[PDB]
């Protein structure tokens, strides 16, 4: 498994969700990214699968006003541009 160092815009989100390190696994980043969604309550509570990330740095990072966890390929696209192998 490959260790990755998230860039500072994503390390900011990661630490906010409860992490502290600079070397992670993609599985960990994924875990903390959901933890962040919970703690900022970025989801529709009448559709908890639609994340509303627009007035939040996760939206600027993703370039998405909102997205569903049915298709987290946006997350994967954004990790490719914000993790250093």
From Swiss-Prot:
<comment type="subunit">
    <text>Interacts with MDM2. Interacts with TP53, TP73 and USP2. Found in a trimeric complex with USP2, MDM2 and MDM4. Interacts (phosphorylated) with YWHAG; negatively regulates MDM4 activity toward TP53.</text>
</comment>
<comment type="function">
    <text>Along with MDM2, contributes to TP53 regulation. Inhibits p53/TP53- and TP73/p73-mediated cell cycle arrest and apoptosis by binding its transcriptional activation domain. Inhibits degradation of MDM2. Can reverse MDM2-targeted degradation of TP53 while maintaining suppression of TP53 transactivation and apoptotic functions.</text>
</comment>
<comment type="similarity">
    <text>Belongs to the MDM2/MDM4 family.</text>
</comment>
<feature type="domain" description="SWIB/MDM2">
    <location>
        <begin position="2"/>
        <end position="85"/>
    </location>
</feature>
<protein>
    <recommendedName>
        <fullName>Protein Mdm4</fullName>
    </recommendedName>
</protein>
């Amino acid at each position: 498994i490959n260790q990755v160092r998230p860039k500072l815009p994503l390390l900011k989100i990661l630490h906010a969700a409860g992490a502290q390190g600079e070397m992670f696994t993609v599985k960990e980043v994924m875990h903390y990214l959901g933890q962040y969604i919970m703690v900022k309550q970025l989801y529709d509570a009448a559709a908890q699968h639609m994340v509303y990330c627009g007035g939040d740095l996760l939206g600027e990072l993703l370039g998405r006003q909102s997205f569903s966890v049915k298709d987290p390929s946006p997350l994967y696209d954004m990790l490719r541009k914000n993790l250093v192998t």
